[PDB]
């Protein structure tokens, strides 16, 4: 699970979920990629589950890139307490995803197994998504 070594500020406001992505909206490293169509917070637990799913399908060969990182912490206050008395301690790390962003990439010799592998990863994510290539 991806976790930053240190963040300057531990308790932060919620990342904004407006607009579409400014940068990262194209495939740079691999041949195929997963492009987002909705806003969400992608947790590191979902990223780990979504790249293991890609691994189990291509088995040996091929390379996988992850283009997003869980940098921003979301806090949760302790259970069954009344409102008030401070702000809760951070629990899970998310990545602010906007439509147009490319999340994962893959480089595999054949097409059908690479497109099938990415579909298994999309079903582990809380958003609509599609498979894109390097061509216009």
């Amino acid at each position: 699970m991806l976790i930053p070594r240190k963040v300057k500020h531990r308790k932060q406001h919620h990342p904004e979920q407006r607009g579409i992505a400014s940068g990262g909206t194209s495939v740079s490293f691999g041949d195929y990629g997963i492009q987002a169509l909705e806003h969400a917070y992608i947790t590191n637990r979902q990223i780990e589950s979504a790249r293991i799913a890609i691994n189990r399908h291509i088995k040996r060969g091929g390379k996988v890139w992850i283009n997003i990182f869980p940098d921003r912490p979301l806090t949760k206050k302790p259970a069954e307490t009344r409102m008030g008395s401070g702000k809760g301690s951070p629990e899970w790390w998310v990545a602010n995803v906007k439509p147009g962003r490319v999340l994962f990439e893959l480089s595999y010799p054949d097409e059908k197994t690479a497109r099938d592998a990415l579909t298994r990863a999309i079903h582990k994510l809380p958003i609509k998504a599609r498979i894109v290539t390097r061509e216009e």
């Binding site: 699970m1 991806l2 579409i20 992505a21 909206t25 194209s26 740079s28 490293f29 169509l37 780990e48 790249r51 691994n55 291509i58 088995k59 040996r60 060969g61 091929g62 390379k63 996988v64 992850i66 439509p99 147009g100 480089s107 010799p109 390097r134 216009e136």
Partner: protein
């Protein structure tokens, strides 16, 4: 290498702005700008379907001959504005060129062949820069990975360019990096 300019009909716009450009797109048009050494930019319009057909069969660096109110003009496609989601063509830049002029252009490099069965191919740089005539720009650049064994850095200086085409980018870029194929244990440790 010689090319034939693609005929397109360009109408001079009457009104410009965000309201007028949105209306033009809804009618199936693309705003475009014709600057260059003419040094008096013309704000033109192009048929959306006909313009994109030229790009499909000739690439982004497509030479064009335009019909502005009855007068021809050689133009080059300089840049395209594309919506990330809808994959539109919201805008286009056209640069005036004349025969014999040298222009610096980014062309795509394509990987072909079948290397050693125990290797994985990873192309790093998608495009490289060249400098050719107005009508003598290659539509693609081709590299071959055949019998290439283990780790070899194919370099931008080893790409076979046609006559009259000079590489502009530095000759030490890493274009294709053939590497030993990852194993099931290399997949698992990479990314956690």
């Amino acid at each position: 290498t010689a090319n034939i300019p693609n005929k397109l009909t360009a109408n001079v716009r009457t009104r410009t702005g965000k309201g007028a450009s949105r209306q033009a797109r809804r009618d199936g048009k693309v705003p475009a700008v014709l600057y260059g050494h003419g040094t008096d930019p013309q704000h033109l319009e192009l048929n959306a379907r006909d313009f994109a057909a030229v790009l499909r069969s000739h690439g982004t660096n497509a030479i064009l001959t335009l019909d502005i109110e009855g007068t021809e003009q050689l133009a080059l496609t300089k840049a395209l504005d594309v919506h990330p989601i809808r994959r539109n063509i919201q805008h286009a830049d056209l640069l005036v060129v004349q025969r014999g002029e040298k222009v610096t252009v980014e062309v795509t490099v394509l990987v072909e062949g079948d290397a050693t069965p125990g290797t994985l191919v990873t192309q790093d740089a998608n495009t490289i820069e060249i400098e050719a005539e107005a009508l003598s720009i290659p539509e693609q650049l081709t590299v071959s990975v055949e019998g290439v064994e283990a780790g070899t850095q194919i370099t931008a200086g080893q790409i076979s360019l046609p006559e009259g085409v000079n590489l502009i980018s530095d000759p030490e870029l890493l274009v294709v990096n053939v590497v030993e194929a990852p194993s099931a244990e290399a997949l698992e440790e990479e990314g956690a």
